[PDB]
Amino acid sequence: YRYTGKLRPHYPLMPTRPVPSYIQRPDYADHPLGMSESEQALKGTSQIKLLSSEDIEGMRLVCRLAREVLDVAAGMIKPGVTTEEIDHAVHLACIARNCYPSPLNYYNFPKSCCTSVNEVICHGIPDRRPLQEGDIVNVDITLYRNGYHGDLNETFFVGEVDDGARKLVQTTYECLMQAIDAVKPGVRYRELGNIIQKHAQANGFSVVRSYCGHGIHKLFHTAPNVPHYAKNKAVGVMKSGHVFTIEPMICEGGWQDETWPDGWTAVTRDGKRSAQFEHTLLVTDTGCEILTRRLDSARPHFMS
């Protein structure tokens, strides 16, 4: 394997961390290949669930808990901390909240969160690498509580970063929020990528095409598929009671990605940096409810 940048995996990884049996587990948790039978039964379907009142309450709770766990991770970001160390804290924080860390054994993913540094577009595996001053690092949190998943991520600065890091992360955040600001009943899912790509390209950046936002509720990933680039063919129209993520990945160079031998780590083919932000959104009668927002503070962590 020819690496695309300076980042390398730092092995060995700790043995997988158990989750106490009192915590409710998603179907894939005990599947030998981490397949989700429930997801697989709906593969290829475009139909989108209209959440009940009970569903909405369940999503509100799990997404609030997820935000709390991301905030725990945000508090740990400093030069010298390993991504494994972040992940262990996340794992314990999920357990403390009576939640299962959704990524754990999801299609055999080995850890409880995804940590994506510099050229990693997404799905980085926490490992022995200490964070370096100047890095950017994304932590992506997903929790499972009472049958519901809640999903969010933010990119953080490690100590002092360069102007390019600042511009990339700021623009990415703005892309997410411009998209969220457009969500309301009657808007086509395909419009979001037009908005994201417009702002990205105005700032000299590209939009990852291989990964998309997703429906989430009882399933971790389901309809709708929500591309973040322009002129996409996504199927569907927002309606009150729809829940889905928006999770744009934006790159300093070209948009092309490739995957490490680990089968997970997605990296820029050019080795330039990428940044991401994610919220889980509920479409309401007039707009949307940002289920994974901060309740206590105005801004994402990188502006705080």
Q: Which residues bind K ion (CB under 5 A)?
A: 116, 120, 274
Q: Does 301 show up as a binding residue in the annotation? A: no
Residue 296 is labelled as binding a ligand: no
247 is in an annotated binding site: yes
Shortest distance (Å) from residue 134 CB to ligand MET: 25
Residues in the chain: 304
- Closest contact distance (angstroms) between CB of 122 and K ion is 8
What 268-271 contacts at long range (C-beta under 8 Å, 24+ apart), as own/partner pairs, is 268/4, 268/5, 268/119, 268/121, 269/4, 270/4, 271/3, 271/4, 271/5, 271/6, 271/119
Alpha carbon distance 231, 49 (integer Å): 25
DSSP code of residue 238: -
Q: How far is the CB of 224 from Co ion (least distance, A)?
A: 12
* Bridge partners for 275 per DSSP: 250
Identify residue 257 by its one-letter amino acid code. D
Beta carbon of residue 114, minimum distance to K ion (angstroms, whole number): 10
| Binding letters toward ligand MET, positions 140-179, x by CB under 6 A | x-x--------x----------------------------
Between 84 and 119, CB nearer to K ion: 119
The answer to whether the beta carbons of residues 99 and 150 sit under 8 Å apart is no
In the complex, the residues that contact ligand MET under the rule CB under 6 A are 103, 106, 109, 114, 123, 140, 142, 151, 245, 247, 278
> Which segments are annotated as binding site?
123, 140, 151, 214, 221, 247, 278
> Which segments are annotated as binding site for a protein?
123, 221
